[PDB]
Design an enzyme around this catalytic site. Structure first.
Site, PDB file in Angstrom:
ATOM      1  N   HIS A 110      73.112 -27.037  82.931  1.00  0.00           N
ATOM      2  CA  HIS A 110      72.188 -26.155  83.660  1.00  0.00           C
ATOM      3  C   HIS A 110      70.763 -26.807  83.268  1.00  0.00           C
ATOM      4  CE1 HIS A 110      71.018 -23.439  80.043  1.00  0.00           C
ATOM      5  NE2 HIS A 110      69.713 -23.443  80.858  1.00  0.00           N
TER       6      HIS A 110
ATOM      7  N   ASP B 245      79.019 -24.922  81.701  1.00  0.00           N
ATOM      8  CA  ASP B 245      77.820 -25.205  81.282  1.00  0.00           C
ATOM      9  C   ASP B 245      77.845 -26.418  80.036  1.00  0.00           C
ATOM     10  OD1 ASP B 245      74.985 -25.310  81.736  1.00  0.00           O
ATOM     11  OD2 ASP B 245      74.660 -23.416  81.115  1.00  0.00           O
TER      12      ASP B 245
ATOM     13  N   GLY C  76      64.693 -21.410  76.126  1.00  0.00           N
ATOM     14  CA  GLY C  76      64.155 -22.441  75.308  1.00  0.00           C
ATOM     15  C   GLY C  76      65.222 -22.744  74.089  1.00  0.00           C
TER      16      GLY C  76
ATOM     17  N   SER D 163      68.552 -23.075  75.120  1.00  0.00           N
ATOM     18  CA  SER D 163      69.594 -23.313  75.667  1.00  0.00           C
ATOM     19  C   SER D 163      70.314 -24.987  75.148  1.00  0.00           C
ATOM     20  CB  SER D 163      69.556 -23.621  77.380  1.00  0.00           C
ATOM     21  OG  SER D 163      69.625 -22.071  77.883  1.00  0.00           O
TER      22      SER D 163
END
Ligand SMILES: CCOC(=O)c1ccc2nc(N)sc2c1
Length: 238
Positions: free
Chosen positions: A41, A89, A188, A190
Protein backbone atom coordinates in the site's frame (compact mmCIF):
# COMPACT_ATOMS: atom_id res chain seq x y z
CA UNK A 1 4.11 6.03 16.65
CA UNK A 2 1.71 7.36 19.31
CA UNK A 3 3.24 7.59 22.76
CA UNK A 4 6.21 5.34 23.21
CA UNK A 5 9.56 7.02 23.45
CA UNK A 6 12.28 8.31 21.16
CA UNK A 7 15.24 6.20 20.10
CA UNK A 8 18.11 5.83 17.64
CA UNK A 9 18.83 3.30 14.91
CA UNK A 10 20.99 1.28 17.33
CA UNK A 11 17.80 -0.13 18.86
CA UNK A 12 16.38 -1.24 15.45
CA UNK A 13 19.53 -1.66 13.33
CA UNK A 14 17.29 -3.18 10.65
CA UNK A 15 14.69 -0.41 10.32
CA UNK A 16 14.80 1.39 6.94
CA UNK A 17 13.67 4.88 5.87
CA UNK A 18 12.11 5.09 2.39
CA UNK A 19 11.68 8.42 0.58
CA UNK A 20 10.48 9.45 -2.89
CA UNK A 21 11.07 12.30 -5.36
CA UNK A 22 12.02 14.20 -1.58
CA UNK A 23 9.48 13.18 1.07
CA UNK A 24 9.14 10.32 3.53
CA UNK A 25 6.97 7.39 2.42
CA UNK A 26 7.16 4.48 4.85
CA UNK A 27 9.38 2.36 7.02
CA UNK A 28 11.02 -0.93 6.11
CA UNK A 29 12.92 -3.88 7.57
CA UNK A 30 16.28 -5.13 6.32
CA UNK A 31 15.82 -8.90 6.24
CA UNK A 32 19.12 -9.48 4.40
CA UNK A 33 22.08 -7.61 2.81
CA UNK A 34 20.23 -6.79 -0.43
CA UNK A 35 16.63 -6.96 0.72
CA UNK A 36 14.16 -4.69 2.46
CA UNK A 37 10.59 -5.80 3.18
CA UNK A 38 7.85 -3.19 3.60
CA UNK A 39 4.12 -2.85 2.79
CA UNK A 40 2.64 -2.68 -0.72
CA UNK A 41 0.00 0.00 0.00
CA UNK A 42 3.01 2.28 0.48
CA UNK A 43 3.96 2.16 -3.21
CA UNK A 44 0.85 1.24 -5.18
CA UNK A 45 0.27 4.85 -6.37
CA UNK A 46 3.82 5.46 -7.64
CA UNK A 47 4.76 1.82 -8.43
CA UNK A 48 8.01 2.90 -10.10
CA UNK A 49 11.55 2.09 -8.81
CA UNK A 50 13.41 5.15 -10.07
CA UNK A 51 11.66 7.35 -7.48
CA UNK A 52 12.60 5.63 -4.23
CA UNK A 53 15.50 6.28 -1.95
CA UNK A 54 16.19 3.89 0.87
CA UNK A 55 18.31 4.53 3.91
CA UNK A 56 19.72 2.17 6.53
CA UNK A 57 21.31 3.19 9.83
CA UNK A 58 19.29 6.43 9.78
CA UNK A 59 18.00 7.75 13.13
CA UNK A 60 16.55 11.08 11.95
CA UNK A 61 13.90 12.08 9.39
CA UNK A 62 15.38 15.23 7.79
CA UNK A 63 19.04 15.26 8.80
CA UNK A 64 21.76 12.68 8.38
CA UNK A 65 22.99 10.15 10.94
CA UNK A 66 26.72 9.51 11.03
CA UNK A 67 27.09 6.17 9.28
CA UNK A 68 23.85 5.80 7.31
CA UNK A 69 23.87 4.28 3.83
CA UNK A 70 21.83 5.51 0.88
CA UNK A 71 20.43 3.04 -1.62
CA UNK A 72 18.57 3.13 -4.91
CA UNK A 73 15.77 0.64 -5.58
CA UNK A 74 17.02 -1.98 -8.00
CA UNK A 75 13.58 -3.63 -7.91
CA UNK A 76 10.18 -2.87 -6.36
CA UNK A 77 8.27 -6.12 -5.92
CA UNK A 78 4.63 -5.70 -4.89
CA UNK A 79 2.46 -8.68 -3.90
CA UNK A 80 0.10 -9.63 -6.70
CA UNK A 81 -2.98 -10.55 -4.60
CA UNK A 82 -3.31 -7.11 -3.01
CA UNK A 83 -6.43 -5.04 -2.32
CA UNK A 84 -6.79 -2.44 0.54
CA UNK A 85 -8.46 -4.40 5.68
CA UNK A 86 -5.78 -4.37 3.23
CA UNK A 87 -4.75 -7.50 1.82
CA UNK A 88 -1.39 -9.02 1.20
CA UNK A 89 0.08 -5.68 2.20
CA UNK A 90 3.66 -6.83 1.62
CA UNK A 91 6.38 -5.28 -0.56
CA UNK A 92 10.01 -6.10 -1.39
CA UNK A 93 12.71 -3.52 -2.20
CA UNK A 94 15.97 -4.70 -3.80
CA UNK A 95 18.61 -2.18 -2.73
CA UNK A 96 21.79 -1.06 -4.52
CA UNK A 97 24.00 1.99 -3.98
CA UNK A 98 25.51 4.09 -6.77
CA UNK A 99 28.63 2.07 -6.02
CA UNK A 100 26.67 -1.09 -6.80
CA UNK A 101 26.89 -2.73 -3.36
CA UNK A 102 24.14 -3.86 -1.01
CA UNK A 103 24.01 -3.07 2.73
CA UNK A 104 27.01 -3.75 4.93
CA UNK A 105 26.47 -4.86 8.53
CA UNK A 106 27.52 -2.26 11.07
CA UNK A 107 26.79 -1.18 14.63
CA UNK A 108 23.79 0.78 13.31
CA UNK A 109 22.95 -1.63 10.46
CA UNK A 110 21.99 -5.28 10.75
CA UNK A 111 19.34 -7.62 9.39
CA UNK A 112 16.34 -9.14 11.17
CA UNK A 113 15.24 -12.78 11.04
CA UNK A 114 11.87 -14.07 9.78
CA UNK A 115 9.66 -16.38 11.89
CA UNK A 116 9.35 -20.14 11.56
CA UNK A 117 6.55 -20.63 9.02
CA UNK A 118 3.02 -20.14 10.39
CA UNK A 119 4.56 -19.72 13.85
CA UNK A 120 3.39 -16.72 15.87
CA UNK A 121 3.76 -15.80 19.54
CA UNK A 122 0.72 -16.34 21.71
CA UNK A 123 -1.64 -13.42 22.04
CA UNK A 124 -0.97 -11.03 24.90
CA UNK A 125 2.72 -11.07 24.03
CA UNK A 126 4.67 -7.82 23.95
CA UNK A 127 6.12 -6.72 20.66
CA UNK A 128 7.74 -3.45 19.60
CA UNK A 129 6.87 -1.25 16.62
CA UNK A 130 9.23 1.36 15.09
CA UNK A 131 8.81 4.42 12.84
CA UNK A 132 8.82 8.12 11.94
CA UNK A 133 5.02 8.42 11.98
CA UNK A 134 2.87 11.06 13.68
CA UNK A 135 3.04 11.22 17.48
CA UNK A 136 -0.58 12.38 17.47
CA UNK A 137 -3.44 12.20 14.99
CA UNK A 138 -3.90 15.97 14.72
CA UNK A 139 -0.21 16.55 13.96
CA UNK A 140 0.56 17.90 10.54
CA UNK A 141 4.24 16.99 10.93
CA UNK A 142 6.10 13.72 11.53
CA UNK A 143 8.62 13.44 14.39
CA UNK A 144 12.19 14.43 13.55
CA UNK A 145 13.39 11.63 15.81
CA UNK A 146 12.80 7.89 15.41
CA UNK A 147 10.34 6.52 17.95
CA UNK A 148 9.16 3.13 19.25
CA UNK A 149 6.82 1.50 21.75
CA UNK A 150 5.29 -1.78 22.87
CA UNK A 151 1.89 -3.28 22.10
CA UNK A 152 0.22 -6.61 22.86
CA UNK A 153 -1.04 -9.15 20.36
CA UNK A 154 -4.81 -9.39 20.14
CA UNK A 155 -6.21 -12.84 19.25
CA UNK A 156 -7.95 -13.27 15.89
CA UNK A 157 -11.17 -13.92 17.78
CA UNK A 158 -10.98 -10.64 19.66
CA UNK A 159 -10.14 -8.54 16.61
CA UNK A 160 -12.95 -10.11 14.60
CA UNK A 161 -15.60 -8.98 17.07
CA UNK A 162 -17.99 -6.73 15.17
CA UNK A 163 -17.19 -3.98 17.70
CA UNK A 164 -13.44 -4.31 16.86
CA UNK A 165 -12.67 -4.69 13.15
CA UNK A 166 -15.28 -7.19 12.03
CA UNK A 167 -14.52 -9.32 8.99
CA UNK A 168 -11.93 -6.85 7.68
CA UNK A 169 -9.31 -8.78 9.64
CA UNK A 170 -8.05 -12.13 8.30
CA UNK A 171 -5.93 -15.08 9.42
CA UNK A 172 -3.21 -13.31 7.41
CA UNK A 173 -3.12 -10.23 9.62
CA UNK A 174 -2.22 -9.74 13.27
CA UNK A 175 -3.76 -7.17 15.61
CA UNK A 176 -1.78 -5.43 18.34
CA UNK A 177 -2.69 -2.72 20.80
CA UNK A 178 -2.25 -1.11 24.17
CA UNK A 179 -4.67 -2.28 26.87
CA UNK A 180 -5.44 1.39 27.56
CA UNK A 181 -5.14 2.35 23.88
CA UNK A 182 -2.65 5.10 24.70
CA UNK A 183 0.23 3.90 22.50
CA UNK A 184 -0.02 2.78 18.90
CA UNK A 185 1.24 3.12 15.38
CA UNK A 186 -0.05 6.05 13.34
CA UNK A 187 0.15 7.48 9.83
CA UNK A 188 3.77 7.39 8.73
CA UNK A 189 4.54 4.08 10.49
CA UNK A 190 3.43 1.85 7.66
CA UNK A 191 5.63 -0.91 6.32
CA UNK A 192 7.76 -1.12 9.33
CA UNK A 193 8.63 -3.73 11.80
CA UNK A 194 6.40 -5.41 14.37
CA UNK A 195 9.08 -7.25 16.28
CA UNK A 196 8.38 -9.83 18.91
CA UNK A 197 10.99 -11.95 20.63
CA UNK A 198 9.85 -15.50 19.94
CA UNK A 199 11.56 -18.71 21.02
CA UNK A 200 14.05 -16.30 22.57
CA UNK A 201 15.02 -14.68 19.27
CA UNK A 202 14.00 -11.34 17.74
CA UNK A 203 11.77 -11.94 14.71
CA UNK A 204 9.84 -9.91 12.17
CA UNK A 205 6.30 -10.90 13.20
CA UNK A 206 4.53 -8.22 11.23
CA UNK A 207 4.62 -5.19 8.98
CA UNK A 208 2.66 -2.07 9.95
CA UNK A 209 -0.28 -2.37 7.56
CA UNK A 210 -3.48 -0.51 8.53
CA UNK A 211 -5.88 0.49 11.29
CA UNK A 212 -8.96 2.61 12.01
CA UNK A 213 -7.41 5.72 13.49
CA UNK A 214 -4.55 5.85 15.98
CA UNK A 215 -4.82 4.79 19.62
CA UNK A 216 -8.64 4.63 19.78
CA UNK A 217 -10.56 2.16 21.94
CA UNK A 218 -11.24 -1.21 20.25
CA UNK A 219 -9.28 -0.22 17.13
CA UNK A 220 -5.98 -2.10 17.05
CA UNK A 221 -3.28 -1.45 14.51
CA UNK A 222 -3.14 -4.22 11.91
CA UNK A 223 0.01 -5.88 10.66
CA UNK A 224 0.85 -8.20 7.78
CA UNK A 225 1.37 -11.66 9.24
CA UNK A 226 4.91 -12.34 8.02
CA UNK A 227 4.80 -16.04 8.94
CA UNK A 228 2.09 -16.46 6.28
CA UNK A 229 4.29 -15.16 3.45
CA UNK A 230 7.65 -16.94 3.68
CA UNK A 231 7.33 -18.82 0.35
CA UNK A 232 6.47 -15.51 -1.30
CA UNK A 233 9.37 -13.87 0.50
CA UNK A 234 11.65 -16.78 -0.32
CA UNK A 235 10.68 -17.05 -3.98
CA UNK A 236 10.72 -13.34 -4.74
CA UNK A 237 14.13 -12.73 -3.15
CA UNK A 238 15.77 -15.51 -5.14
C1 LIG B 1 0.43 5.50 5.82
C2 LIG B 1 -1.02 5.87 5.74
O1 LIG B 1 -1.40 6.53 6.95
C3 LIG B 1 -2.68 6.25 7.61
O2 LIG B 1 -3.70 6.81 7.22
C4 LIG B 1 -2.72 5.30 8.78
C5 LIG B 1 -3.80 5.36 9.73
C6 LIG B 1 -3.85 4.46 10.84
C7 LIG B 1 -2.82 3.49 11.01
N1 LIG B 1 -2.60 2.51 11.94
C8 LIG B 1 -1.46 1.81 11.68
N2 LIG B 1 -1.04 0.78 12.47
S1 LIG B 1 -0.57 2.30 10.27
C9 LIG B 1 -1.71 3.47 9.98
C10 LIG B 1 -1.68 4.35 8.91
Amino acid sequence: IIGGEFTTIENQPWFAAIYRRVTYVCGGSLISPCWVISATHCFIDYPKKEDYIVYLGRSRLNSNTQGEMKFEVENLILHKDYSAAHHNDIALLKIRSKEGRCAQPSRTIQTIALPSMYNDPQFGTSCEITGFGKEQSTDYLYPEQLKMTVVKLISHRECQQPHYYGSEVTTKMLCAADPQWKTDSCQGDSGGPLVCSLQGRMTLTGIVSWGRGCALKDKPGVYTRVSHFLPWIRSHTK
